[PDB]
């Protein structure tokens, strides 16, 4: 029996209606959304969260999505490209520019790009 | 349709007159509705901007073309697009989104075909739990799903027993009629009257339904239901009224 889902970076649709009926039995499912900069594992802004014998599924309902920014003094072959949490990408700077602290790649983390994709 | 997107609110209109769309606006972006050469944009932030439902036909689905957008690195990109479906009543409304296409993850300025149907929200004057009449009430109206807008809703509420039950009929995409099992009528956080229970294929459980009561005398019900056939989740928009 699953209690109200703590959907980090998301939440339930029809929250007010559904809230008074928790806990829910195994097999129950609800439509949920993801906040700004986040997405469902299916790559959408919404999906269904399921009450399984192992608890709420998906276990990580909302994943960060990082858009590759325009680089002043860098090559823009990846501008307006979407990357999902965990994915990394090489940063190609113009000659005489580099990523700070001798970095070669940026990674999409729960709080955004690490480090910030910038050619100093 | 065009008038609903441009014209202002007037008392002379057949209610529900105004509807807020906050739940249909994802990722703190914008929602743009278009029909008959007209256009209106809704931002997730403000609640003062609303759809003029007073211009729309009662007891019918109104269909607007939709586009959900987000602002990223100066540039504004399309998150999703499809058909916005609004079913209108006197004190209530059911909003469903038929998503036809989503943002292409590899080419953000373009789109990929991906179909999904979501009942995103409701609207109207909610019935306070303390405004519930005595005895029983019967409701009749629509049930609508992905490419299935002619289903029927039959629903009965025993206010004294704080309980309701009903049925969804004539949904082409569903093999059987959907039983809306005996469910408890409760007060939510805002002290509004709500019902939530099981959807069934006879006696076999398949999902959940929930309804909110609308109007000062619980004249209407509006909500949503789900049916799970194998791994496919069917979302259904439901709304009825006292005849």
Numbering used by the authors:
A (entry chain A): 324 to 443
B (entry chain D): 81 to 126, 126A, 126B, 126C, 127 to 210, 212 to 321
The paper states:
Factor H binding protein (fHbp) is a 27 kDa surface lipoprotein consisting of two β-barrels that promotes resistance against complement mediated lysis and is a key meningococcal antigen that elicits SBAs. We have shown previously that fH CCP 6 and 7 (fH67) are necessary for high affinity interactions with V1 fHbp, and that these two CCPs are sufficient to inhibit binding of full length fH to fHbp. Here we characterised members of the three variant families by identifying amino acids that are critical for fH binding and through structural analysis, to inform future vaccine design and to understand the basis of the interaction of fHbp with fH. Here we show that even though V1, 2 and V3 fHbps exhibit remarkably conserved atomic structures, differences in key amino acids necessary for interactions with fH are only revealed by functional studies.
